[PDB]
Amino acid sequence: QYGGETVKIVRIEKARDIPLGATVRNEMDSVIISRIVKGGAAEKSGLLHEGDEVLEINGIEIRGKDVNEVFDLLSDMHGTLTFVLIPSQETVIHVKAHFDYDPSDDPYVPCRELGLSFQKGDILHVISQEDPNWWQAYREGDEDNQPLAGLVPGKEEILTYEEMSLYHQPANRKRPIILIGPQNCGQNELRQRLMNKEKDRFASAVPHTTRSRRDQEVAGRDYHFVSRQAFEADIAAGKFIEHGEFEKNLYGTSIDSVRQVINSGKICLLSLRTQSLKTLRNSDLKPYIIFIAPPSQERLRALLELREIIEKTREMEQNNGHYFDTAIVNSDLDKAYQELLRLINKLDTEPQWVPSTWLR
């Protein structure tokens, strides 16, 4: 009964007419907790988490409904709560704005009661930068009686002029190549074709792993087996472009290994999530970022709800990404591949533009 899955029963105390600082979405036949808003009883108890779901609230089933009756139920009950759930699978940094913003005109915000309008020249407490596209914040001089938090756009520092310079690729120390884009628009096939049709002109970066040494991969041919203590020490030092736990072990990618590959006359290839760029630019690798994007819905459905969400996610990675230096519109595959080879061969006989910092 009640799904018969890994079930937990939790208790949270709620008064009358008091929001509980949780954001509930509505996707396929189930209700999903989406955010935890600080300063609310949910954060105080520190029990609920994002990604979970709901079965029944105070003994009344939930699955099979929309959000509005859930809202009506929660806005009419007080006292001790009873929730049924299955589990999931910082420090203040005062800032000062330099523009204007007003949520009621922005058709993009992931809620409408957490806007937090503010004029130019204010001061903000920022509490969490966890979701790197929407920060949680408090306006200075109003801290206590908000009472909850607010959301503010996560524009990274972007100037209104810079200083660029010409740069010529040397004879035999070639710049990396770094592909980014949405999750399901054929990056992997492109990588495999590039590494298979041409075999002696590309390479890769061997990662770090804290697993056990199986009897198929020896010393430095496929991994860099180490002890976990060194791994957390390196994370603290900040030597990792990207790192993520998986299966009780740790993976990643270093910065020395990329130098080993780039230091012998080959073109490194990679693939990244949109998070890591901030760490990559500040170093001196001198990357070259390429954005692979899908075309409109009609031709894509020709190629192969899910279409709409993929177009939407494509939209998000632009309008707050301005680093990269070229966009490839995916099409007939063996035309995008030709375009990619054209671009990469172009670098050898045509100088390029880099911010002048990377040379001083």
Partner 1 sequence: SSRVPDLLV
Contacts with a copy of itself by CB under 8 A lie at 93-99, 121, 123, 155-166, 322, 353
Q: Is 182 annotated as a binding residue?
A: yes
- Contacted entry of partner 1, a copy of itself, none for residue 32, CB cut-off 5 to 8 Å set by kind: none
Alpha helices (runs of H) in 275-332, residue ranges in sequence order = 277-282, 297-303, 306-317
Instruction: In angstroms, give the least distance from the CB of 113 to a copy of itself.
Output: 24
Q: Which residues pair with 164 in a beta bridge?
A: 355
Backbone φ and ψ for 20, nearest 5 degrees, come out as -100, 15
CA distance 304 to 301: 5
Asked if 84 and 2 touch (Cβ cutoff 8 Å), the reply is yes
Residue 37 binding: pick among a copy of itself, partner 1, none (C-beta 5-8 Å cut-off by kind): partner 1
The smaller minimum CB distance to a copy of itself, of residues 100 and 113, is found at: 100
**C-beta of 106 vs 232, nearer to a copy of itself:** 106
Which of 36, 37, 126, 180 is the binder for partner 1 (CB under 8 A)? 37
Q: Is 186 annotated as a binding residue?
A: yes
Q: What is the DSSP letter of 247?
A: T
Looking at 8, 11, 25, 278, which residue binds partner 1 (CB under 8 A)? Answer: 25
Give the whole-angstrom CA distance, residue 201 versus residue 179. 17
Cβ 167 to a copy of itself shortest distance, Å: 11
The CA distance from 335 to 203, in Å, is 23
Contact status: 81 vs partner 1 (CB under 8 A): no
User: Degrees (nearest 5) of the Cα angle 322, 324, 327?
Assistant: 105
Q: Which two structure tokens, joined as six digits, stand for 332? A: 């007939």
Instruction: Tell me whether residue 32 or residue 95 sits nearer to a copy of itself (CB atom).
Output: 95
**List of residues 6+ apart from 41 with CB closer than 8 A:** 12, 13, 14, 18, 20, 21
The residue among 35 and 174 lying less far from partner 1, judged by its C-beta, is: 35
Least distance (Å) from partner 1 to the CB of residue 90?
23
Contacts with partner 1 in 84-143 (CB under 8 A)? Answer: 107, 109-114
Determine how β-strand 13-14 pairs with β-strand 79-80.
antiparallel
CB 128 within 8 A of CB 135: yes
Query: x-or-dash pattern for partner 1, window 50-69, by CB under 8 A?
Result: -----------------xx-
Cβ of residue 50: shortest distance to partner 1, in angstroms?
12
Q: How far apart are CA 136 and CA 344, in angstroms?
A: 41
128 contacts: CB under 8 Å, gap ≥ 6: 38, 90, 135, 136
Least distance from a copy of itself to the Cβ atom of residue 101, Å? 10
158: helix, coil or strand? coil
Q: Count residues near partner 1 (CB under 8 A).
A: 24
Question: According to the annotation, is 119 in a ligand binding site?
Answer: no
Chosen from a copy of itself, partner 1, none, partner binding at 94 (C-beta under 5 to 8 Å by type): a copy of itself
Q: Confirm or reject binding of residue 309 to partner 1 (CB under 8 A).
A: yes
Nearer to partner 1, 64 or 244 (CB): 64
Could you list the residues that contact partner 1 (CB under 8 A)?
19-26, 34, 37, 67-68, 70-71, 74, 107, 109-114, 309, 312
Instruction: Point out the annotated binding site for ATP.
Output: 181-188
Instruction: Point out the annotated binding site.
Output: 181-188
